[PDB]
Amino acid sequence: AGLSFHVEDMTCGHCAGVIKGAIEKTVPGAAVHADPASRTVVVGGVSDAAHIAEIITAAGYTPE
Numbered sequence: 118a119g120l121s122f123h124v125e126d127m128t129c130g131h132c133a134g135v136i137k138g139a140i141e142k143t144v145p146g147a148a149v150h151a152d153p154a155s156r157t158v159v160v161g162g163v164s165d166a167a168h169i170a171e172i173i174t175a176a177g178y179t180p181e
Contacts, residue, residue, distance in 0.1 A: 119147065119161040120169060127178040129153030139172045140164070 133151035136158055140149045147162035160169060173179065 119159060120164055120166050121160075122158045122169065122173060124156055124158070124173065124178050124180045126180055127153065127156050129156065132176055132178050133158075135176050136173060136178075139176065140169055143168065143172075 130153050133153045137149045137151045140158075140160060141147075144160070144164045147160055147164050149158070149160050151158040158169075158173065
């Protein structure tokens with residue numbers, strides 16, 4: 118029961134590693150699970166959504 122982000126234009130298998138590490142590194146404890154197969158990134162527990170959104174955009178994978 119955390120935050121969910123969905124990106125259609127996200128290249129799969131080349132983003133999950135970046136986004137997962139990027140969020141987890143700055144957000145300790147909270148578990149980050151990125152699934153490029155579903156094109157969805159989920160962060161459990163609690164996290165600043167604004168910071169995650171900057172991370173996803175910074176990785177260059179934003180939705181239409």
